[PDB]
């Protein structure tokens, strides 16, 4: 899936995508890489696949505020190698 290959002349700031982490309520954390313009949809699924749980049964919050899969890591301008808190709330079902 590393089919991203620009013939650009990047010299000063060689950056593209950043690393993120998701801490689960179980005390485990996953380390992954996501692009700035890449939707959290893949993020939520990535962690879900790793931990072996349902994304519909969990929630993601960052910096005190909640984030939906429809948001991007650039939308709130998070830092590289930052972490997101995950909690699994079964309420009413």
UniProtKB/Swiss-Prot annotation:
Cross-link entry Peptide (Met-Gly) (interchain with G-Cter in ubiquitin), positions: 1
CC terms in the record's Gene Ontology section: GABA-ergic synapse; glutamatergic synapse; hippocampal mossy fiber to CA3 synapse; nucleoplasm; nucleus; PML body; postsynaptic cytosol; presynaptic cytosol
Protein location: Nucleus; Nucleus, PML body
4Fe-4S among keywords: no
Effect on the protein of changing residue 33 to E: Significantly impairs sumoylation of MTA1
Entries under InterPro entries matching the protein: Rad60/SUMO-like_dom (IPR022617), Ubiquitin-like_dom (IPR000626), Ubiquitin-like_domsf (IPR029071)
A single GO molecular function term of this UniProt record: SUMO transferase activity
One GO-annotated biological process of the protein: positive regulation of transcription by RNA polymerase II
Gene3D superfamilies: Phosphatidylinositol 3-kinase Catalytic Subunit, Chain A, domain 1
Cross-link (Glycyl lysine isopeptide (Lys-Gly) (interchain with G-Cter in SUMO2)) at residue(s): 5, 7, 11, 21
Glycyl lysine isopeptide (Lys-Gly) (interchain with G-Cter in SUMO), cross-linked positions: 11
Primary location group: nucleus
PTM annotation (N6-acetyllysine): residues: 11
Modification note: Polymeric chains can be formed through Lys-11 cross-linking. Polymeric SUMO2 chains undergo 'Lys-6'-, 'Lys-11'-, 'Lys-48'- and 'Lys-63'-linked polyubiquitination by RNF4.
Record cross-link Glycyl lysine isopeptide (Lys-Gly) (interchain with G-Cter in ubiquitin), residues: 11
Subunit and interaction comment: Interacts with SAE2 and UBE2I. Interacts with ZNF451. Identified in a complex with ZNF451 and UBE2I/UBC9, where one ZNF451 interacts with one UBE2I/UBC9 and two SUMO2 chains, one bound to the UBE2I/UBC9 active site and the other to another region of the same UBE2I/UBC9 molecule. Covalently attached to a number of proteins. Interacts with PELP1. Interacts with USP25; the interaction sumoylates USP25. Interacts with SIMC1, CASP8AP2, RNF111 and SOBP (via SIM domains). Interacts with MTA1. Interacts with HINT1. (Microbial infection) Interacts with Epstein-barr virus BGLF4.
The family this protein is said to belong to: Belongs to the ubiquitin family. SUMO subfamily.
Name assigned to this protein: Small ubiquitin-related modifier 2
Naturally occurring in which organism (per UniProt): Homo sapiens
């Amino acid at each position: 899936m590393a089919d991203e290959k620009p013939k650009e002349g990047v010299k000063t700031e060689n950056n593209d995508h950043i690393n993120l982490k998701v801490a689960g309520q179980d005390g485990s954390v996953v380390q992954f890489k996501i692009k700035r313009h890449t939707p959290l949809s893949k993020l939520m699924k990535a962690y879900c696949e790793r931990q072996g749980l349902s994304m519909r049964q969990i929630r993601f919050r960052f910096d005190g505020q909640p984030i939906n899969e429809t948001d991007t890591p650039a939308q709130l301008e998070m830092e590289d190698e930052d972490t997101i808190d995950v909690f699994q709330q079964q309420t009413g079902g």
